[PDB]
Structure prediction request, 95 residues.
Amino acid sequence: MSVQIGNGLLMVVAPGTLTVGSA
Amino acid sequence: MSVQIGNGLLMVVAPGTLTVGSA
Amino acid sequence: PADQPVHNYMIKRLDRRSLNAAFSIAVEALGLISGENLDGTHISSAMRL
Prediction:
């Protein structure tokens, strides 16, 4: 009763790298 | 040219549930 | 008087400057793209687009 949907949130913030580089 | 690295971010915020419960 | 050939050595230093931009994101419109609160109806996908 303690593990991974905030430890969810926690690991896979992962598949976001662009946050593009362009205006 | 529109799908999943912000739809990346979007789905798998998932593997984070603790964000522990303890001080 | 005569002369000698003269040399010299110079050292130019680097510089650092970082230009940065920042773009904000909405709060209300956070599900449509997502599926936490996305719903199987037909209007949610339209607002999603």
